[PDB]
Amino acid sequence: SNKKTKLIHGGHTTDDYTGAVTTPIYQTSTYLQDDIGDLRQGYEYSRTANPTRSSVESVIATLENGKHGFAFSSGVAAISAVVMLLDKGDHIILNSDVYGGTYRALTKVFTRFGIEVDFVDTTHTDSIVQAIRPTTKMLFIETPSNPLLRVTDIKKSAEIAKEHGLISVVDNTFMTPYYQNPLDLGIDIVLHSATKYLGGHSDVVAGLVATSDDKLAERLAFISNSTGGILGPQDSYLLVRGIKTLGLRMEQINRSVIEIIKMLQAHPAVQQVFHPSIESHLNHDVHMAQADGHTGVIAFEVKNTESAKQLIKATSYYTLAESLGAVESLISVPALMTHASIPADIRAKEGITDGLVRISVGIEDTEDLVDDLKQALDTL
Amino acid sequence: SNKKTKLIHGGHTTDDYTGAVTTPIYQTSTYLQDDIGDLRQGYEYSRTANPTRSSVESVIATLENGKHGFAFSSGVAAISAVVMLLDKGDHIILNSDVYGGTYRALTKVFTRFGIEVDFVDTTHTDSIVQAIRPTTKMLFIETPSNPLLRVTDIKKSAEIAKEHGLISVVDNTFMTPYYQNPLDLGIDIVLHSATKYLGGHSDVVAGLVATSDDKLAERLAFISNSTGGILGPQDSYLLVRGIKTLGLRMEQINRSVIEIIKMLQAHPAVQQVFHPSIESHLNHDVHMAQADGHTGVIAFEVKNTESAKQLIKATSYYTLAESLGAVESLISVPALMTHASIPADIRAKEGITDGLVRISVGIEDTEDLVDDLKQALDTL
Amino acid sequence: SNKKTKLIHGGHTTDDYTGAVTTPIYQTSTYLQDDIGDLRQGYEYSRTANPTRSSVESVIATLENGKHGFAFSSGVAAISAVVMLLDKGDHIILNSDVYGGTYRALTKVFTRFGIEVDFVDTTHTDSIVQAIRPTTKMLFIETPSNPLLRVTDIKKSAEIAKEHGLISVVDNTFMTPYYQNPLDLGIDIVLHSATKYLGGHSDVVAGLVATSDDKLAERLAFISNSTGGILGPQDSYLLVRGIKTLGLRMEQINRSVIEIIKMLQAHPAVQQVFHPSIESHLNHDVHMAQADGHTGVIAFEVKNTESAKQLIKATSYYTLAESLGAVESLISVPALMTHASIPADIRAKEGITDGLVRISVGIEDTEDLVDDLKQALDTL
Amino acid sequence: SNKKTKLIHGGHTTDDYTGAVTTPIYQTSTYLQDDIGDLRQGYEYSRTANPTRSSVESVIATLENGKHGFAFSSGVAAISAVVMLLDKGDHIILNSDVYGGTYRALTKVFTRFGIEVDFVDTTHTDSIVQAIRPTTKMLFIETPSNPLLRVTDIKKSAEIAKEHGLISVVDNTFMTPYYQNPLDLGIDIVLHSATKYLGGHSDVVAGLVATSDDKLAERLAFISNSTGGILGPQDSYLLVRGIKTLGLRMEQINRSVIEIIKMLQAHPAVQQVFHPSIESHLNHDVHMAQADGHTGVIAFEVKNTESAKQLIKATSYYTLAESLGAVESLISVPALMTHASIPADIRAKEGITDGLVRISVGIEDTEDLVDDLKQALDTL
């Protein structure tokens, strides 16, 4: 029925055999066959299928309202598998500010295999239509994006993709299936870095993919089996376990996000704040139309590198580390940690200023997170 | 010093911090930074590097006498990473009877990305020289191969590759580093399905890669980080644990292999036996020159499908399952399980007869394995 | 600062060495010594101390505002260790309705070792004073109790224990440290079946003990080391992980508990409801004075065995299984599952009627849990 | 049939449900019941029984030729459970040099519960007969003992126990079931610290118990369920995995033991050597009558503390750490590490001289272990 119930009872996460109320961890590579070709429960080799992996695959399919789930050894392994649906000479349209690892994979790996990519500003969906070439096969969209949280209209992207025969893909990592369901809006394939919110505890690197399309699912299964970027059973188990509390975690994070944004907007040492909940944010109305909650990632401007570093030193409850979606609140400086490759003038042009801070809101008490960040900002 | 000592004390498999005599399992995705960019021990994000994965990587590099190790989510993920060293338009020479998963990946995935492949009979190394095209970049060799155990001269392959500027790769799964060290013979890259002998216990799917080449290592690290087919920490730990007993297991397997082959050659219901220890086997002398032991995989002919199936039913200690390198002895019928896709007439032409049986010798008592298989053959 | 923050940042649950943001899993039994007797970080043998176990021990000590934590292989192993603080001839006072496993251990194991026990109704604390013998050494109190949720005044129990030289112990399983802190009220020792709420995911059997008393801690450490009921590192890790979401889970459970109790009190097929939040419940005022929330365990009466069984069959979201504190809502019938040993007439006398149902409220959506249980009650 | 085959195929270590060739890890606390009291496969609560624990229990029962197995959180938890078969006023006879942890448990824990113990020299079995009191209920024997490897006649001990109505117990840790089977010689109960050889990889703390006696098994099951010192599922799994290679490891260790003892006896810086394989060792003939191999623990005398410490510093392949039965060879000095509590004069009287060295032989190459220890002895 409701979302918090579906998180607990959706998917197959018990043992039919013993009745165990959690998925057994099948730390195994192969399976007895009673006769040649007769598989007791359909398992024959863990790369092809593993019962613990099958459990987390059924969870993500259920939560995204798809039919088929796939678990990969990382988010970028999921992305790489989806890109390998295409051939040399095929073309992909992506949003201009995709995740750095996605940008790296596409422009430094798959470009050597002859896949062509263009990065366009998808906040206006007619820019997608202009970029469509005769060779375009795929539209790949993150929303909201990192680190400036640009929003793309998912449903219009799906219609454009359908009209032009494109496979549509949404990287739904930042919103999670608790708040945004791209398959319900016509998207062909949805994927996640489960390393972030889904696992939720900073202790699994994993990617998840769901689709309702039988033929796309069969092609993904073939690629997964052939290139072998499969999630292991122990990580599959920890993913299933972490997903149980996804709703509670996301709701705590959202309460804190609202209060933190009020504080940031009021504070004199903060300039621009980037988050889709802000009413003046581009495509705010579009985000509310396609999601019923918010990501915990917020970016905001302080004055310069020195203020950003002192902010980090002065906070007691914001932890300096890579990644997002932890139970701890995380803090980082994109210009130094994710975009330090880009020359400074182009960084500034894109809005990645020296004093741009990104926080990933965790599940600490709301008042503590607000008060801690405010008192640290007061030291500026 | 000697091999069994190096298995125990080679690589870094203790905890410098606590002194723990086994590698801690870092079930973690990210790492505190004391200041922006300052990593306490060089770790920042588990996809890029994880201390448990680093441990198994240092073991495989040590055991193969290389400098750099890489752990992937499966054997075929390791193979896929190595193939991705090449670009569209590049050409690969492989032995004609490569592992089915390798054949599938190359001819159904990477061919769509414009990598060109030819499968040639490398048992004569001048067939490699004939196949070399202006676009050839890589020579990929398994030895001995599956399921007929064809042997390829590793050292001459390495010289040919050096002379023509080719990256040379050996799939060393069947022999393990305990018996065959391709990097010592001039090969650029050695790889393994650690799913088999290295893990040794049928409970991890994993691939391992080693090289001494700094620049190839840097390219593999970039591909691993970008396409994300990384082995998880729990599987990395179980791999390190299984490798400790590799020498004892391989030596038990070899004692049984010798006795089983004597029995098979003497038995009237057995026709041809395929194994590199047989003196009339093609390139027997070459195998002894490049290895100091034997794989546990043996193939042999019985009369037909019915005899093969009754053999399986009559054995008490041979287990019908996919994979090899278990502690249990495994039995299978290639024509029904690995080559059933190939039309029957071409199967017979290649020597994959209906009555071709493959066994993977385990670590059960030698006399039991010999006696069990003999009494089952007597029922034919 | 506030409770939800302390759950995330309290205790030592990172790796000082690598910076890993989660506790490494030390699957290890022993530790290198640089010289005889010099331990790098104080570890020498995992039974005596293990760094992953040390992490969960520091969490429970922090959450209960104690100084010393201890992790055992189960709740009853923790209880057994605490009982072994006493000698033959010593006497224990416990509440009359202690957990069945505690009753079993005391009256069928430790009674054979000459420990004497009396079970008294501690809802009136003067009954403790009357039961105190010259040989009494320990007062052991659960509050609230199972399955009728009787409440005992913790602070008065602590004063009585101090006045008469008794070691005071509270089994704080049902309330968790999120809502009730016995050490802050003068109790000597607090313990938990971490199998329930603390782990929270039905996937660890474990006991935890905390104290502020240096000398009691030293005696518990000696008993733990000597009788060896230690929690393993993998379970220790999963406990630390589950505790992160304890606050969010308990708060969801409490919202559902309030609404479910309203429904139960209004429903015509329900007679008596047992829960400390009900204002007419014995020692309701005492519970509010010593706790700032509620357990998720509720008991209530339907008509008979048949109604209880049909209730179970008609619910979609209440799961029939043993244990409590899961993310799933659990349902059971004490007279058939925990008290079937007791003759029926004595069952009825104690209030364990045939139609007494116990539910453990999980973290499903509140409206679903209320509506599901109501519609099932309507079928009666 | 033969021992190495029984190690692989004995016990139930596959999944009947999926066919998985390894035991699934049931990281779970509780189990769905289809109706009240109807258990799908007999499981209801993991403390009472867990399917992964059940697997390792069936292995130890099979390997010791018993009927019932029990897995505890440590060796001393197994010992404590067996001691709790007795009541206050009952008396136990143990060998005079039992393991220090066993001595500690008995004389500092269970003595407070009124169990009486006498430690006698069981190398002459008539000393057992003399020590038998009217209150004696149990005979507890280690053979061979630590650190001087005294041998006790198991079969005569069993007959004495039967004649006088005693429960007989053998701590079979040092020999393992691969070489010595006390239940076959009439002993009632056999137990192990699986922390040592059985796990074999220094990464599990665990105890195992086997018996053929239905009534003793029922009493052990009740004590295990009631005091809760149960082994967890992950450790149970690693135990099952480690036991697979027990035969190969023990045989490698035995080859090295023979050669090392030759070297030690010939070396001028070595005085007495203690090991049951030495023909002049007390009860050498008795050991050969009840075992078909040897423990890897050897003790030998050098001159003094300084020589012992320099020996440790000069070895490359002997590791200074607590415990035994690792894949690594371990070295220690009892007078400083296990018997430093005992005054020096009594240490010397018992034979625990300052220069007494204990080694636990691992699975490194035999020639390396011999040569390394010899060259280090030459520096004396």
Ligand SMILES: *Cc1c(COP(=O)(O)O)cnc(C)c1O
């Ligand atoms: C309610 C519920 C569903 C239905 O989810 P929708 O959001 O309506 O698609 C599925 N599974 C479970 C377990 C549920 O409780």
Ligand SMILES: *Cc1c(COP(=O)(O)O)cnc(C)c1O
């Ligand atoms: C002997 C030894 C080596 C050297 O191995 P080679 O085969 O000579 O290359 C390396 N590491 C360890 C731990 C050794 O014992």
Ligand SMILES: *Cc1c(COP(=O)(O)O)cnc(C)c1O
């Ligand atoms: C707030 C806080 C504490 C203090 O907890 P009290 O309830 O005041 O005893 C301890 N640790 C952490 C991490 C905290 O945030």
Ligand SMILES: *Cc1c(COP(=O)(O)O)cnc(C)c1O
């Ligand atoms: C041979 C064998 C046995 C019999 O063992 P004994 O030592 O004769 O008691 C039991 N189980 C298996 C799997 C065996 O192979």
Ligand code: NA
């Ligand atoms: Na479900």
Ligand code: NA
């Ligand atoms: Na669709």
Ligand code: NA
């Ligand atoms: Na080493």
Ligand code: NA
């Ligand atoms: Na080279």
Ligand code: NA
């Ligand atoms: Na902390």
Ligand code: NA
């Ligand atoms: Na106190």
Ligand code: NA
């Ligand atoms: Na078996």
Ligand code: NA
């Ligand atoms: Na007997």
